[PDB]
Amino acid sequence: PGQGRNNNGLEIGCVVDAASGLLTFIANGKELSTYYQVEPSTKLFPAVFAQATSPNVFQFELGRIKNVMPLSAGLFKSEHKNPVPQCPPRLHVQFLS
Amino acid sequence: RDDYDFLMQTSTYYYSVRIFPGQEPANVWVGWIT
Amino acid sequence: NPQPVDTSNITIPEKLEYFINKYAEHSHDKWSMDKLANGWIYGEIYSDSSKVQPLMKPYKLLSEKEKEIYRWPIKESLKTMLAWGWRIERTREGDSMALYNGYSPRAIDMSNVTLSRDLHAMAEMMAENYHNIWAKKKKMELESKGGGNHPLLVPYDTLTAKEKAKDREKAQDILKFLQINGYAVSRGFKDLELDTPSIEKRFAYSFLQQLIRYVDEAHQYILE
């Protein structure tokens, strides 16, 4: 759309269908055209590549949208049926070194 | 209101990334890696 | 002796009129921020004791003379930047932006927007120029009153960070909004040719040539 990020930071939403392997992305509440289909048993790590043009770069948000499970519910086995989003201490940001 | 039964039978998971205003979006990539 | 580069002769291009309007809107918007934060309220009657002011109508609803106070400093800033020759270019992104193109105002946060090294140098130069403008007005007032040397009349270089704060923030935020709008601003002058292989322009060559001339002159003086 343009000019929709200066007012409020842009939000890409990543949804993964573990039952079908369909990777689709939504940005600013509208689905993007690009989609990825992965093969079964694929282990996918959330990842962000960024070159910093600011003191603050980005922010991992672990919320949920309508009709979708939070990320912790898929990451952890004990939280498989817990709609409340969670960020347990095991989860942490890693970087290539 | 989200359907509680759909949330229990579903396998779709979500996370989002906020690029703070002032950071160039062309320099930021979001998605999944193996 | 303060001399800003005179901008009366130079005129703004018509293509930058979109930016002029948009930054006038953004300045009105930050003014709405401070107005609402202080607690003034919208009302057709303008009272200072009642703490009410009608200028919470949007920028389009503002009067033409009301818009003057905003785009005026904008006009001087741009004519100052252009009188220095700094070529301002206009990217495809803003072209998409122009093609794209109960009062709840909301500004654009410039906290994370950042400039480059060279852009910082340019912002510092335009900032000191604005400060010399203020210096000329203060000095005309000063020997209009005869005396009263103002403490901040010292050069911009002599100024301190706290004194430089508001000048610097203005001179930077204008460039920040220019960048986020997408205008391409760079240096005005361009190199014509550097005669790098020229041995002459090496300092040693000129030094030794001058030494040769001096030694030969001294030789003639001792011969006579």
Curated annotation (Swiss-Prot), chain A:
Name of the protein in question: Ryanodine receptor 2
Family label: Belongs to the ryanodine receptor (TC 1.A.3.1) family. RYR2 subfamily.
Protein localization: Sarcoplasmic reticulum membrane
Disease affiliated with this protein: Ventricular tachycardia, catecholaminergic polymorphic, 1, with or without atrial dysfunction and/or dilated cardiomyopathy: An arrhythmogenic disorder characterized by stress-induced, bidirectional ventricular tachycardia that may degenerate into cardiac arrest and cause sudden death. Patients present with recurrent syncope, seizures, or sudden death after physical activity or emotional stress. CPVT1 inheritance is autosomal dominant.
Full-protein residues shown: 1496 to 1592 of 4967
SS bonds (residue pairs): none
Phylogenetic classification of the source organism: Eukaryota, Metazoa, Chordata, Craniata, Vertebrata
Gene responsible for this protein: RYR2
Subunit: Homotetramer. Can also form heterotetramers with RYR1 and RYR3. Interacts with FKBP1A and FKBP1B; these interactions may stabilize the channel in its closed state and prevent Ca(2+) leaks. Interacts with CALM and S100A1; these interactions regulate channel activity. Identified in a complex composed of RYR2, FKBP1B, PKA catalytic subunit, PRKAR2A, AKAP6, and the protein phosphatases PP2A and PP1. Interacts directly with FKBP1B, PKA, PP1 and PP2A. Interacts with SELENON. In cardiac muscles, identified in a complex, composed of FSD2, CMYA5 and RYR2.
Domains (record comment): The calcium release channel activity resides in the C-terminal region while the remaining part of the protein resides in the cytoplasm.
